[PDB]
């Protein structure tokens, strides 16, 4: 289970990759990076614009492809694939369940190996 970790979304910037830390659109006191976290029976999908969604994997459709690729369907379609396994960097391609529109396809760092800075995102440009 290579996908089993807290995956923090990274953003490429002019000064290198960072983990942005967002005050949530629903509640400015809730401040967190975006992430996908898989620990046992749970898949947590957390964006900057909504409360985190914690899905029970016992109701999910889970498939494994080749080369340690995996997909999970709850209310969204999540596909995991390594990007740089030595740097513990993976990509989560997140789509609607019809697979018609891609929602995001960020790179992520396993939080246990994260060396990028956590930078508090500043909404008021």
């Amino acid at each position: 289970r290579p996908y089993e970790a807290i995956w923090l979304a990274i953003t490429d910037t002019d000064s290198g990759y960072v983990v942005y830390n967002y005050p949530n659109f629903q509640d400015e006191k809730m401040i967190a990076p975006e992430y996908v976290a898989i620990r046992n029976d749970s898949l947590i999908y957390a964006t900057w614009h909504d409360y985190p969604e914690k899905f029970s994997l016992k109701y999910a459709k889970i498939e494994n492809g080749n080369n340690e690729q995996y997909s999970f369907v709850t209310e969204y379609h999540f596909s995991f694939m390594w990007v740089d396994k030595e740097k513990h960097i993976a990509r989560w391609t997140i789509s609607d369940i019809q697979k018609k529109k891609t929602i995001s396809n960020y790179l992520y760092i396993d939080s246990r190996y994260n060396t990028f800075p956590l930078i508090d995102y500043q909404w008021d440009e």
């Binding site: 629903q26 964006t47 614009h49 909504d50 209310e75 969204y76 369940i97 995102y121 440009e125």
Partner: protein, 190 residues
């Protein structure tokens, strides 16, 4: 037909008016999406066949909310009835309405007055208790293959003082009251 209980037709325009979330790369980067609530509501108005010049922030709006006290100090009740009437007559013509909401509860930042809008797209009743359906552009969550902001539990309830108050399906903490009605402009040459 007309409803026995409430005496009006029940209306649900959702199948004719596509939903739009504000959390969409068509509005730009995250910082632009963050302030795109009005723009997404305007996409919904043009999805319904109205002019892109609809819902200006000018003196045609119906301004219901005005700036030890009563609970109704900031509500103009005559304007509340006017806004209600305009909503009923647009829905009966087949058009949605873009409205501004304030928070009874669950503001994302009580220290600020960030403008928020929703779009009313329907009307019904339960035992003569009138409700209005709305599209909430302020969510990107999806469920059962659709956006949560298009779900039928996005309902405003008509209160005894003719204000409209309710809760979006994606965030049970938010309690809206409708404080501003913006005007539709038809697609006409002159």
């Amino acid at each position: 037909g007309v409803c026995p209980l409430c005496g009006k037709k029940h209306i649900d325009l959702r199948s004719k008016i596509d939903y739009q979330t504000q959390f969409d790369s068509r509005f730009g980067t995250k910082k632009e999406q963050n302030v795109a609530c009005y723009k997404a509501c305007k996409v919904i108005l043009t999805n319904a066949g109205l002019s892109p010049n609809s819902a200006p922030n000018d003196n045609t709006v119906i301004q219901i909310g005005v700036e030890s006290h009563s609970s109704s100090l900031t509500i103009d009740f005559v304007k509340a009835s006017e806004g209600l009437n305009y909503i009923n007559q647009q829905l009966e013509t087949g058009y949605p309405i873009l409205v501004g909401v304030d928070y009874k509860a669950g503001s994302p930042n009580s220290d600020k007055t960030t403008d928020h809008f929703i779009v009313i797209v329907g009307r019904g009743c339960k035992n003569n208790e009138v409700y209005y359906l709305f599209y909430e552009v302020g969510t990107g969550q999806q469920e059962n293959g659709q956006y949560k902001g298009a779900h039928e539990n996005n309902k405003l309830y008509l209160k005894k003082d003719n204000t409209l108050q309710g809760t979006p399906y994606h965030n049970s903490n938010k309690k809206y009251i409708v404080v501003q009605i913006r005007k539709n402009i038809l697609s006409l040459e002159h």
